[PDB]
Design an enzyme around this catalytic site. Structure first.
Site, PDB file in Angstrom:
ATOM      1  N   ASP B  25      30.781  -8.895  30.508  1.00  0.00           N
ATOM      2  CA  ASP B  25      31.763  -7.781  29.911  1.00  0.00           C
ATOM      3  C   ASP B  25      32.395  -7.110  30.908  1.00  0.00           C
ATOM      4  OD1 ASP B  25      33.554  -6.169  28.371  1.00  0.00           O
ATOM      5  OD2 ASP B  25      31.848  -5.863  26.913  1.00  0.00           O
ATOM      6  N   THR B  26      33.306  -7.294  31.621  1.00  0.00           N
ATOM      7  CA  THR B  26      33.869  -6.467  32.968  1.00  0.00           C
ATOM      8  C   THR B  26      34.211  -5.039  32.313  1.00  0.00           C
ATOM      9  OG1 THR B  26      36.024  -7.525  32.851  1.00  0.00           O
ATOM     10  CG2 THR B  26      34.168  -8.328  34.234  1.00  0.00           C
ATOM     11  N   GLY B  27      34.821  -4.889  31.047  1.00  0.00           N
ATOM     12  CA  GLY B  27      35.159  -3.723  30.341  1.00  0.00           C
ATOM     13  C   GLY B  27      34.179  -2.981  29.827  1.00  0.00           C
TER      14      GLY B  27
HETATM   15  O1  LIG Z   1      32.607  -1.183  24.602  1.00  0.00           O
HETATM   16  C1  LIG Z   1      32.965  -1.317  25.681  1.00  0.00           C
HETATM   17  N1  LIG Z   1      33.981  -1.872  26.267  1.00  0.00           N
HETATM   18  C2  LIG Z   1      34.973  -2.611  25.628  1.00  0.00           C
HETATM   19  C3  LIG Z   1      36.353  -2.170  26.323  1.00  0.00           C
HETATM   20  C4  LIG Z   1      36.265  -0.739  26.126  1.00  0.00           C
HETATM   21  C5  LIG Z   1      36.317   0.197  27.240  1.00  0.00           C
HETATM   22  C6  LIG Z   1      36.015   1.633  27.124  1.00  0.00           C
HETATM   23  C7  LIG Z   1      36.404   2.246  25.880  1.00  0.00           C
HETATM   24  C8  LIG Z   1      36.687   1.331  24.672  1.00  0.00           C
HETATM   25  C9  LIG Z   1      36.624  -0.045  25.016  1.00  0.00           C
HETATM   26  C10 LIG Z   1      34.647  -3.979  25.729  1.00  0.00           C
HETATM   27  O2  LIG Z   1      34.807  -4.459  27.001  1.00  0.00           O
HETATM   28  C11 LIG Z   1      35.720  -4.594  24.911  1.00  0.00           C
HETATM   29  N2  LIG Z   1      35.325  -4.718  23.515  1.00  0.00           N
HETATM   30  C12 LIG Z   1      35.226  -5.875  23.064  1.00  0.00           C
HETATM   31  C13 LIG Z   1      33.525  -5.733  22.446  1.00  0.00           C
HETATM   32  C14 LIG Z   1      32.623  -5.064  23.258  1.00  0.00           C
HETATM   33  C15 LIG Z   1      31.706  -4.628  22.405  1.00  0.00           C
HETATM   34  C16 LIG Z   1      30.642  -6.049  21.884  1.00  0.00           C
HETATM   35  C17 LIG Z   1      31.579  -7.108  22.257  1.00  0.00           C
HETATM   36  C18 LIG Z   1      32.977  -7.298  22.094  1.00  0.00           C
HETATM   37  S1  LIG Z   1      36.600  -3.835  22.632  1.00  0.00           S
HETATM   38  O3  LIG Z   1      37.055  -2.945  23.318  1.00  0.00           O
HETATM   39  O4  LIG Z   1      35.851  -3.502  21.851  1.00  0.00           O
HETATM   40  C19 LIG Z   1      37.624  -5.150  21.863  1.00  0.00           C
HETATM   41  C20 LIG Z   1      38.583  -5.469  22.832  1.00  0.00           C
HETATM   42  C21 LIG Z   1      39.606  -6.666  22.557  1.00  0.00           C
HETATM   43  C22 LIG Z   1      39.162  -7.238  21.166  1.00  0.00           C
HETATM   44  N3  LIG Z   1      39.960  -8.154  20.734  1.00  0.00           N
HETATM   45  C23 LIG Z   1      39.526  -8.666  19.470  1.00  0.00           C
HETATM   46  S2  LIG Z   1      38.236  -7.579  18.953  1.00  0.00           S
HETATM   47  C24 LIG Z   1      38.214  -6.883  20.591  1.00  0.00           C
HETATM   48  C25 LIG Z   1      37.439  -5.686  20.696  1.00  0.00           C
HETATM   49  C26 LIG Z   1      32.101  -0.014  26.374  1.00  0.00           C
HETATM   50  C27 LIG Z   1      32.842   0.603  27.378  1.00  0.00           C
HETATM   51  C28 LIG Z   1      32.174   1.467  28.284  1.00  0.00           C
HETATM   52  C29 LIG Z   1      30.726   1.788  27.942  1.00  0.00           C
HETATM   53  C30 LIG Z   1      29.994   0.795  27.012  1.00  0.00           C
HETATM   54  O5  LIG Z   1      28.849   1.106  27.087  1.00  0.00           O
HETATM   55  C31 LIG Z   1      30.649  -0.033  26.509  1.00  0.00           C
END
Ligand SMILES: O=C(N[C@@H](Cc1ccccc1)[C@H](O)CN(CC1CCCCC1)S(=O)(=O)c1ccc2ncsc2c1)c1cccc(O)c1
Lengths: 99, 99
Positions: B25-27
């Site tokens: 998870d690059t995000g």
């Molecule tokens: O949650 C994070 N990172 C997020 C991105 C993020 C970064 C910073 C602030 C908010 C979010 C993820 O990379 C993308 N999310 C998808 C999820 C991740 C959690 C469990 C699996 C699936 S997500 O953002 O929740 C996501 C994205 C696209 C999507 N499409 C359909 S459901 C869905 C969910 C994150 C950011 C910084 C620190 C940290 O500890 C975690």
């Protein structure tokens, strides 16, 4: 290009007359953009991650330019704290993970 | 390996002799695993995602083998929807984005 992960993989994307910084996010199934009033039909949706769910508007067939590469697809618009380029578009611009 | 993104980049990890499936998870800044037991001292921490903030347990200097590649670093344990490998460990295994 090659993007290392020492810092957040933020890049410039363009959607109409807005350039935005967005994460190239392999953890994101879908593309989620900060609130913006895009033209056209949409459908409501709820997407989940850490903390719970947010409500978004799903817009289809929206052209987006990501680092000069062209993409076109579904974009979810809602109260995300960060613009997120998800796998639906990452594949279109040729993006892979490598190690 | 090279990993394309038409499917979720799920990989087998080894942590405490246990095999688990985790998302590259690059995000994500941090590595966050679903509720599990790990040995040693932990610190309470809070992290934020798309849906808000959650409470996690922070464990430092934890070894994880990700798809055959050794990391030793910080692992957060809490109510993430899915086990995620974030940038703190992605950098350790030499992971980059390429397109
Ligand atoms: O949650 C994070 N990172 C997020 C991105 C993020 C970064 C910073 C602030 C908010 C979010 C993820 O990379 C993308 N999310 C998808 C999820 C991740 C959690 C469990 C699996 C699936 S997500 O953002 O929740 C996501 C994205 C696209 C999507 N499409 C359909 S459901 C869905 C969910 C994150 C950011 C910084 C620190 C940290 O500890 C975690």
């Amino acid at each position: 290009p090659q993007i290392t992960l020492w810092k957040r993989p933020l890049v410039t994307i363009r959607i109409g007359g807005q350039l935005k910084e967005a994460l190239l996010d392999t953890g994101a199934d879908d593309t989620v953009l900060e609130e913006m009033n895009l033209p056209g039909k949409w459908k409501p949706k709820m997407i989940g991650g850490i903390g719970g769910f947010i409500k978004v508007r799903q817009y289809d067939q929206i052209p987006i330019e990501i680092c000069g590469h062209k993409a076109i697809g579904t974009v979810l618009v809602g109260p995300t704290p960060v613009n997120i380029i998800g796998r639906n578009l990452l594949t279109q611009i040729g993006c892979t993970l490598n190690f």
